[PDB]
Motif scaffolding. Structure first.
Motif, PDB file in Angstrom:
ATOM      1  N   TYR C 247      70.550  98.062  -6.273  1.00  0.00           N
ATOM      2  CA  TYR C 247      70.178  99.108  -5.338  1.00  0.00           C
ATOM      3  C   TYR C 247      68.658  99.103  -5.177  1.00  0.00           C
ATOM      4  O   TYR C 247      68.142  99.149  -4.074  1.00  0.00           O
ATOM      5  N   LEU C 248      67.954  98.982  -6.294  1.00  0.00           N
ATOM      6  CA  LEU C 248      66.498  98.997  -6.232  1.00  0.00           C
ATOM      7  C   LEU C 248      65.931  97.728  -5.601  1.00  0.00           C
ATOM      8  O   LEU C 248      64.917  97.802  -4.903  1.00  0.00           O
ATOM      9  N   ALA C 249      66.583  96.585  -5.816  1.00  0.00           N
ATOM     10  CA  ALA C 249      66.217  95.341  -5.136  1.00  0.00           C
ATOM     11  C   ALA C 249      66.361  95.485  -3.634  1.00  0.00           C
ATOM     12  O   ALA C 249      65.501  95.018  -2.881  1.00  0.00           O
ATOM     13  N   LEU C 252      63.498  97.608  -2.247  1.00  0.00           N
ATOM     14  CA  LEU C 252      62.257  96.824  -2.118  1.00  0.00           C
ATOM     15  C   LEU C 252      62.334  95.939  -0.877  1.00  0.00           C
ATOM     16  O   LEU C 252      61.373  95.820  -0.118  1.00  0.00           O
ATOM     17  N   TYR C 253      63.472  95.281  -0.708  1.00  0.00           N
ATOM     18  CA  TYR C 253      63.692  94.433   0.460  1.00  0.00           C
ATOM     19  C   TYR C 253      63.363  95.173   1.749  1.00  0.00           C
ATOM     20  O   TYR C 253      62.555  94.696   2.554  1.00  0.00           O
ATOM     21  N   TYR C 254      63.960  96.348   1.942  1.00  0.00           N
ATOM     22  CA  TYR C 254      63.718  97.105   3.168  1.00  0.00           C
ATOM     23  C   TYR C 254      62.322  97.693   3.282  1.00  0.00           C
ATOM     24  O   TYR C 254      61.861  97.962   4.385  1.00  0.00           O
ATOM     25  N   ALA C 255      61.643  97.880   2.154  1.00  0.00           N
ATOM     26  CA  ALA C 255      60.254  98.351   2.183  1.00  0.00           C
ATOM     27  C   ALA C 255      59.310  97.289   2.781  1.00  0.00           C
ATOM     28  O   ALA C 255      58.260  97.629   3.302  1.00  0.00           O
ATOM     29  N   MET C 256      59.687  96.018   2.673  1.00  0.00           N
ATOM     30  CA  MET C 256      58.857  94.905   3.134  1.00  0.00           C
ATOM     31  C   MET C 256      59.350  94.224   4.424  1.00  0.00           C
ATOM     32  O   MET C 256      58.534  93.739   5.210  1.00  0.00           O
ATOM     33  N   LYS C 257      60.665  94.176   4.647  1.00  0.00           N
ATOM     34  CA  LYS C 257      61.195  93.507   5.852  1.00  0.00           C
ATOM     35  C   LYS C 257      60.840  94.214   7.140  1.00  0.00           C
ATOM     36  O   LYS C 257      61.167  95.384   7.325  1.00  0.00           O
ATOM     37  N   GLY C 258      60.170  93.482   8.028  1.00  0.00           N
ATOM     38  CA  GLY C 258      59.719  94.027   9.300  1.00  0.00           C
ATOM     39  C   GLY C 258      58.224  94.286   9.352  1.00  0.00           C
ATOM     40  O   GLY C 258      57.478  93.943   8.421  1.00  0.00           O
ATOM     41  N   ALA C 259      57.798  94.907  10.451  1.00  0.00           N
ATOM     42  CA  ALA C 259      56.391  95.157  10.727  1.00  0.00           C
ATOM     43  C   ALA C 259      55.742  95.984   9.623  1.00  0.00           C
ATOM     44  O   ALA C 259      56.015  97.181   9.460  1.00  0.00           O
ATOM     45  N   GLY C 260      54.888  95.319   8.858  1.00  0.00           N
ATOM     46  CA  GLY C 260      54.115  95.981   7.827  1.00  0.00           C
ATOM     47  C   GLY C 260      54.915  96.145   6.558  1.00  0.00           C
ATOM     48  O   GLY C 260      55.830  95.351   6.280  1.00  0.00           O
ATOM     49  N   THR C 261      54.557  97.176   5.797  1.00  0.00           N
ATOM     50  CA  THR C 261      55.118  97.421   4.480  1.00  0.00           C
ATOM     51  C   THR C 261      55.152  98.918   4.202  1.00  0.00           C
ATOM     52  O   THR C 261      54.188  99.628   4.481  1.00  0.00           O
ATOM     53  N   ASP C 262      56.254  99.388   3.610  1.00  0.00           N
ATOM     54  CA  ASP C 262      56.291 100.724   3.045  1.00  0.00           C
ATOM     55  C   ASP C 262      55.603 100.639   1.675  1.00  0.00           C
ATOM     56  O   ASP C 262      56.267 100.375   0.664  1.00  0.00           O
ATOM     57  N   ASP C 263      54.280 100.811   1.653  1.00  0.00           N
ATOM     58  CA  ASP C 263      53.522 100.589   0.411  1.00  0.00           C
ATOM     59  C   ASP C 263      53.854 101.605  -0.673  1.00  0.00           C
ATOM     60  O   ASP C 263      53.894 101.255  -1.863  1.00  0.00           O
ATOM     61  N   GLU C 284      68.473  90.159  -9.039  1.00  0.00           N
ATOM     62  CA  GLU C 284      69.335  90.628  -7.934  1.00  0.00           C
ATOM     63  C   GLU C 284      68.710  90.345  -6.585  1.00  0.00           C
ATOM     64  O   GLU C 284      69.410  90.010  -5.628  1.00  0.00           O
ATOM     65  N   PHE C 285      67.387  90.486  -6.505  1.00  0.00           N
ATOM     66  CA  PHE C 285      66.660  90.243  -5.266  1.00  0.00           C
ATOM     67  C   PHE C 285      66.849  88.784  -4.813  1.00  0.00           C
ATOM     68  O   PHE C 285      67.136  88.517  -3.653  1.00  0.00           O
ATOM     69  N   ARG C 286      66.678  87.859  -5.746  1.00  0.00           N
ATOM     70  CA  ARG C 286      66.798  86.424  -5.458  1.00  0.00           C
ATOM     71  C   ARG C 286      68.239  86.076  -5.040  1.00  0.00           C
ATOM     72  O   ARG C 286      68.459  85.416  -4.024  1.00  0.00           O
TER      73      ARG C 286
END
Ligand SMILES: [Ca+2]
Ligand SMILES: [Ca+2]
Ligand SMILES: [Ca+2]
Ligand SMILES: [Ca+2]
Ligand SMILES: [Ca+2]
Ligand SMILES: [Ca+2]
Ligand SMILES: [Ca+2]
Ligand SMILES: [Ca+2]
Ligand SMILES: [Ca+2]
Ligand SMILES: [Ca+2]
Ligand SMILES: [Ca+2]
Ligand SMILES: [Ca+2]
Ligand SMILES: [Ca+2]
Ligand SMILES: [Ca+2]
Ligand SMILES: [Ca+2]
Ligand SMILES: [Ca+2]
Ligand SMILES: [Ca+2]
Ligand SMILES: [Ca+2]
Ligand SMILES: [Ca+2]
Ligand SMILES: [Ca+2]
Ligand SMILES: [Ca+2]
Lengths: 318, 318, 318
Positions: C247-249, C252-263, C284-286
């Motif tokens: 769930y946490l992976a 993180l994925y959605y925080a970075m995928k797309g324009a910019g970053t949810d820092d 899990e991310f990999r």
């Protein structure tokens, strides 16, 4: 010796009970009968567990939901029943303390009739709950010898019951006689020290010796010498020394005798004492007023409120 | 080794004492002599018990009643004597902390002269009493290296006294020489770390080695290199490292020498140290100023205030 | 089984480290590289000791000094790293709770993914730090079934993992089917009780049985039946039940995928999990996104911020 009228329910299942209560409130309307039948048949500690299971199952606050569904004196009674026993006296004191509007009857009733062990616990609960010192708040809203006697009782430092010293009984009975009946005016300080700090068993003997010496019961002298809030407090202290159940039975009697009912007092006494000595209170009530507490409540109250009080009290054929 | 001048009264009866104090204040006027004779002959812990018995017997607050009956410097002294020892230093710090009006002398005197064990206890008492963090409040009202050195001392993390390492004594003495006398300007940071964190026994050796290397006592270098509040704090730290009793004796000396008296400082030192090292302080005072602390107080103060201070101090023929 | 990416540094010397950090900030400019190399190589508990040694040596607050020297996302990351682990989740919740501006994503992410043991500790830390009850603050700023499910989870009263009862798995899977897909509208109450209170191991079995009976994964039903904040919370709860690291992976994925970053989210997940399960999260991310967490961070972030995150994460060749 001391017996309440509410005890732990055998076979308690807090989760089952939480479901029953949810069903009673879910949707339009409210099943007040299911609520009062259940809550009056559970001990205080069991009510707290029910509230926890209800919030675990449904994510709702049980007391807040009941405050939304219920109304009037019934609501006030249910709210009182749900207060943790360890906080209830502190809650009543906090609500009595309101500047010029202070409810002295409540301060007197609770502080005179609670044991030193109870007062120590009340002081702690009050501080934890309200972030204030009980003694400080009492001092702020009272004055005179009434305040002083309350502060003495709040110290919860009454002498322990130990072997009776007859010469000390004589000395204190004579001291009270000299401080009151034989004095032009009154030495309130002497009354406060003796009534506030001597042991219960010692004072019971002093009261009998005082009657022997003076021809008055100490309560008669108090009415002759004092008035106002100090009078009411000294009488409550003497009556509690003689018998806490008798004092509280008398308190209930006056809450109901006459036009209407002091509902606040009726709820407070029944709920606060329900797991301590309400059985003894019923017995003293019947002895002293030739009616059952049950029949007097039955006659003075209405509706779901009446039903719940009667279930809490019991003693149909006292 | 360390001795106060006030100790527990043998045969103490708190209830008897409470009655004496009530009698001293009851009715018109006040018997200041009975009050000061009794309270100066009881330890701090015994004063607290007296206050509790007084409230139990009479429903009155002893300190509040004394604040009503007494006046002037005597009142201030009695109030100080009644503060529980565990709160007194915290109380003085709290009262020193007042924005632009901050009393730096008090911050310096207490924080430099209290041991790490004492400071840990003060920090806790302050937080409990005032709901504020001592370090935060000190930081808010001070600045610069003065603030920094106070924060270092407040950490109460001074190295423990352990076996002395001669090469470390050499290194630190040389470090101080390079940071001050040999430097254009001053490396205050180095002084603060060494004076603030090294063990007492290590620093006593460093001070002697520093004199050997430089030809100056460390106090002379401090006066040569710094000024203002930082100077006063570093001197108080060095003097306390050498001897807390000597530093406090010097503090009393300057509170009295010259026009009038710093009464606040006189009361604080005498009361705060009365059960710790006031005897040692008297001895250092006599050694260093060729007069008794007693005679200097006797000469500088008046009335009941003077009488009470003299009873607390003792040492007529020091 | 569960592994972080940051562990205690062997041969730790807090005083040496404090000196390094002081040197990095002393005078004009700032050595950000020395700061990030050191702090990312110390465990949280070790960072706290470094802060204490820094204040002992220099009388300066380490975090306040770093807030003065650093800027931007790097500063935000360093501040997060210095928060004691026991307070960090409480700090993030407190900062999410802001009336109309409430950050529901944070409430959902933390409350769904923390274990009952963790939530008990968070509730206590929050109360101690902020003087407020977490449940009360959550209730004040949320509404509806979203609020109710959060309150259920906050009770931290999930059934313990015990032996699986197959008939109970059948009953709950059928209950969910009847409450959602077979119902016109939705019985959210039933979903909340079952998902909020049953054991993790029991629910994993229910999810498989539900798929067998209905032909839908429970996540598909949730998307079909609900929307808005309740939808996001139920999905986070189901995903966490299946695998917290997964769930946490995904988070993180959605925080970075797309324009910019949810820092904010990137910092929170990396810091909060760095000593618990960030290693599992990387795995899990990999597995799920065919890229390394490292490479995605490397691609999405800049400067000292990027460098510090990469050191915290590791897993160059995941
Ligand atoms: Ca309803
Ligand atoms: Ca109805
Ligand atoms: Ca209502
Ligand atoms: Ca009279
Ligand atoms: Ca009179
Ligand atoms: Ca009267
Ligand atoms: Ca009536
Ligand atoms: Ca007087
Ligand atoms: Ca006088
Ligand atoms: Ca005065
Ligand atoms: Ca110089
Ligand atoms: Ca300089
Ligand atoms: Ca100078
Ligand atoms: Ca003078
Ligand atoms: Ca800098
Ligand atoms: Ca730089
Ligand atoms: Ca900054
Ligand atoms: Ca449906
Ligand atoms: Ca519906
Ligand atoms: Ca949807
Ligand atoms: Ca991106």
């Amino acid at each position: 010796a001391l017996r309440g009228t509410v005890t732990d329910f055998s076979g308690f299942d807090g989760r089952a009970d939480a479901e029953v209560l949810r069903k009673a409130m879910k949707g339009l309307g409210t099943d007040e009968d299911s609520i009062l039948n259940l809550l009056t048949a559970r001990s205080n500690a069991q009510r707290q567990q029910i509230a926890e299971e209800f919030k675990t199952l449904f994510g709702r606050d049980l007391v807040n939901d009941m405050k939304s569904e219920l109304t009037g004196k019934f609501e006030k009674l249910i709210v009182a029943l749900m207060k943790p026993s360890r906080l209830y006296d502190a809650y009543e004191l906090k609500h009595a303390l309101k500047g010029a509007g202070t409810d002295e009857k409540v301060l007197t009733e609770i502080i005179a009739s609670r044991t030193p062990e109870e007062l120590r616990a009340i002081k702690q609960a009050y501080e934890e709950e309200y972030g204030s010192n009980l003694e400080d708040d009492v001092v702020g809203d009272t004055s005179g010898y009434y305040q002083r006697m309350l502060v003495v009782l709040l110290q919860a430092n009454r002498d322990p019951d130990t072997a009776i010293d007859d010469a000390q009984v004589e000395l204190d009975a004579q001291a009270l006689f000299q401080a009151g009946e034989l004095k032009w005016g009154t030495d309130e300080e002497k009354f406060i020290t003796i009534l506030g700090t001597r042991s219960v068993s010692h004072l019971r003997r002093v009261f009998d010796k005082y009657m022997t010496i003076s021809g008055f019961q100490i309560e008669e002298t108090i009415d002759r010498e004092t008035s106002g809030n100090l009078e009411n407090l000294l009488l409550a202290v003497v009556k509690s020394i003689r018998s806490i159940p008798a004092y509280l039975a008398e308190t209930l009697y006056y809450a109901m005798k006459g036009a209407g009912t002091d509902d606040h007092t009726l709820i407070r006494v029944i709920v606060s004492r329900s797991e301590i000595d309400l059985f003894n209170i019923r017995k003293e009530f019947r002895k002293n007023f030739a009616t059952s507490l049950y029949s007097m409540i039955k006659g003075d109250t209405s509706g779901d409120y009446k039903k719940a009080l009667l279930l809490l009290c019991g003693g149909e054929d006292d």
